[PDB]
């Protein structure tokens, strides 16, 4: 579990030298950014439930074979396990948004997920499809371009940050496959 600060520190410790102005300058870009990341995490964590519902319902909508008998979503038990999985994934994505580094997402959620789904016969393509939908929904909330709910916030540039969150979803979607 390492934030962007601990990432700076760890890299300088492997280099075995002091911190210094260059790395600190990039870190002052992070700290100077600040409330854009705060508000972003507030947006995704606010509408989290609804993201998970829509994403997984869309995932069932593209291929109805999951709800077909013999599909992995055919029961209430398997549907429940499905919903909690999407929820946990979005949870750890938000953790990786506050941290600024993907260490918590790599250690706490990603470490042994591929093996697990393969052992349980979960189709990985359908999971990457749901991670993609959560990506689009999460970027749309994070840019406040969501077509249902549009709350007042200071207007500036928040594209970088969108690219960060897209990086995290692409990490998960790349990992599950």
């Amino acid at each position: 579990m390492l934030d962007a600060f601990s990432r700076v520190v760890v890299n300088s410790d492997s280099k075995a030298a002091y911190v210094g102005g260059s790395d600190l300058q990039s870190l002052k870009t992070f700290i100077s950014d600040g409330n854009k990341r705060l508000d972003a995490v507030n947006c995704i964590v606010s509408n989290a439930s609804c993201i998970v519902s829509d994403a997984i319902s869309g995932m069932i909508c593209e291929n109805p074979g999951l709800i077909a008998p013999g599909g992995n979503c055919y029961t209430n038990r398997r549907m429940a396990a499905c919903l909690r999985d999407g929820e946990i994934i979005l949870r750890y994505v938000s953790y990786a948004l506050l941290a600024g580094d993907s260490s918590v997402l790599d250690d706490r959620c990603l470490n042994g997920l591929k093996e697990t789904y393969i052992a349980l016969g979960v189709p990985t393509a359908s999971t990457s499809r749901a991670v993609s939908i959560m990506k689009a929904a999460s970027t749309a909330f994070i840019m406040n371009t969501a077509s249902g709910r549009k709350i007042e916030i200071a207007a500036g540039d928040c594209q970088a940050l969108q690219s960060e969150a897209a990086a995290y979803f692409d990490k998960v979607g790349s990992a599950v496959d």
């Binding site: 929820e87 946990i88 250690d107 042994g112």
Partner: protein, 277 residues
Amino acid sequence: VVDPFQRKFQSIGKIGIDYSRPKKLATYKRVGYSVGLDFPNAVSMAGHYSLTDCTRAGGAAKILMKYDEYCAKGMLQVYKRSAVSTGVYTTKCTEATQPGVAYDVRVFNRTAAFRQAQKPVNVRLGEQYAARKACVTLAHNCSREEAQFKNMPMSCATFLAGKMEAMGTCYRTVRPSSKAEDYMAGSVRMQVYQKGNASGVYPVGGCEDGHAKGDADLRRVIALASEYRAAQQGAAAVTGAQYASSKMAIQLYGHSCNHEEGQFCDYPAVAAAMCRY
């Protein structure tokens, strides 16, 4: 001045001030210091005492029950320092996956402590003497400790459970590396629970996945989640857990017997099934 009631519950003053006639020894054993306990939040401290007594005020041994509580909660703190050492919470103490789970966890643990109190006297005597004997074997000739285990019933039980948690030598924190250790480990656990209950009828307490309706499924889910976190562990953690489980289960259940000493050192997950408690 006060009441008849409250003067039963109160306290005793000094021989020079509060009472003239010099009180005898029995009145210190019968009235004295009167404090009833808190409702207890773990199965390890649940069946040892009274918790309260409406219309009775005991004295001088309630000092001891209060002392066992405070030493026992002092026990839990340290074995929880082991899982949270660097002030950041490790994956050991996560306590949920979904957002609403932890309260249901709290209630399951609580009523499990109440069912631990409902099980009869002969069984709880059995577990007191068993755990006492077990703490004396883990005392390692420390004489202070041995006094403080012959007297404490709660500190023994949380001492065992607590050390089984912080050593990590648990049945659920160790995953076997083979199919042979799967079947061996499974068989050992079965034989432990069959040694506990030969009646063939489930006994109040024990496993007990179901209290209210819709409990069993959450039990299944929390179990599988803890299996996944047990799966994700590092090299250091795994190797430390295996040495610890092999040694500990040898010290408790292998008595210079080369067969079982061999089948503990050979397969550590069987030992971790042998740890029980």
